[PDB]
Design a protein around this ligand. Structure first.
Ligand SMILES: [Ca+2]
Length: 250
């Protein structure tokens, strides 16, 4: 664990840290410091990573408290899977009304990475079930899955599968817009609607391709981002990371 600390990984970078790895941060309002993985590039950008998928090592079917507190494994090398914790993500993303960007980074099973950036990304408090909000989609070749997607299933698919303004759901705390339980169905925690167009906490399907035949109920419950790949393609790696918004300004 590195010595420099701050409010987030950008503060850490601003204080002269140059190496990606594990650092303590202590956002405003946090009761105690906590470890994070910071990705620090050669241009002084320090991203605070809150989700990582890369190998299927961690089961993302976790309950409300586990999603609140965080689960999985932090590593200095950035080679482990984790969910940082909704309370931590709330504390970082809302502190001092600092505008953060979210970057979603996806890797397919062929070694291509794509990104989707969201401006002014926030996660609300537990009293509002950790609601996700953003101001606008700021671009990227992965496309805007959080806007919802037309799967050709129902006329209202886009309304059913958008993510801005969705509360967080787990199997034991359903806050979705579905008469069923999206989190229980898929076995994940996420900002579910009815249910999703972008869902990075799904099941780790080896090799990417899966199908309705994969499960008895034919769930599209993989690690999906429908504006980049079919619902029947599950990413090999994902990263969800945040940075003060100005670090995006060219
Ligand atoms: Ca429901």
């Amino acid at each position: 664990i590195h010595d420099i600390t701050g409010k987030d990984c950008q503060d850490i970078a601003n204080k002269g840290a140059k190496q990606s790895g594990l650092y303590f941060i202590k956002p405003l309002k946090a009761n105690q410091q906590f470890l994070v993985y910071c990705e620090i590039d050669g241009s002084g950008n320090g991203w605070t990573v809150f989700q990582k998928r890369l190998d299927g090592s961690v089961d993302f079917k976790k309950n409300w408290i586990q999603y609140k507190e965080g689960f999985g494994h932090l590593s200095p090398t950035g080679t482990t899977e984790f969910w940082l914790g909704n309370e931590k993500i709330h504390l970082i993303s809302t502190q001092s009304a600092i505008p953060y960007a979210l970057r979603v980074e996806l890797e397919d099973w062929n070694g291509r990475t794509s990104t989707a950036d969201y401006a002014m990304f926030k996660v609300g408090p537990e009293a509002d079930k950790y609601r996700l909000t953003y101001a606008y989609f700021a671009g990227g070749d992965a496309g805007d899955a959080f806007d919802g997607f037309d799967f050709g299933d129902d006329p209202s698919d886009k309304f059913f599968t958008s993510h801005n303004g969705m509360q967080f759901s787990t199997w034991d705390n359903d806050n979705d817009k579905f008469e069923g339980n999206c989190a229980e169905q898929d076995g994940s925690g996420w900002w579910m609607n009815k249910c999703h167009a972008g869902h990075l906490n799904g099941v780790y399907y080896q090799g990417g391709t899966y199908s309705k035949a994969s499960t008895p109920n034919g769930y599209d419950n993989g690690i999906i981002w429908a504006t980049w790949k079919t619902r029947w393609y599950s990413m090999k790696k994902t990263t969800m990371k945040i940075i003060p918004f100005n670090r995006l300004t060219i």
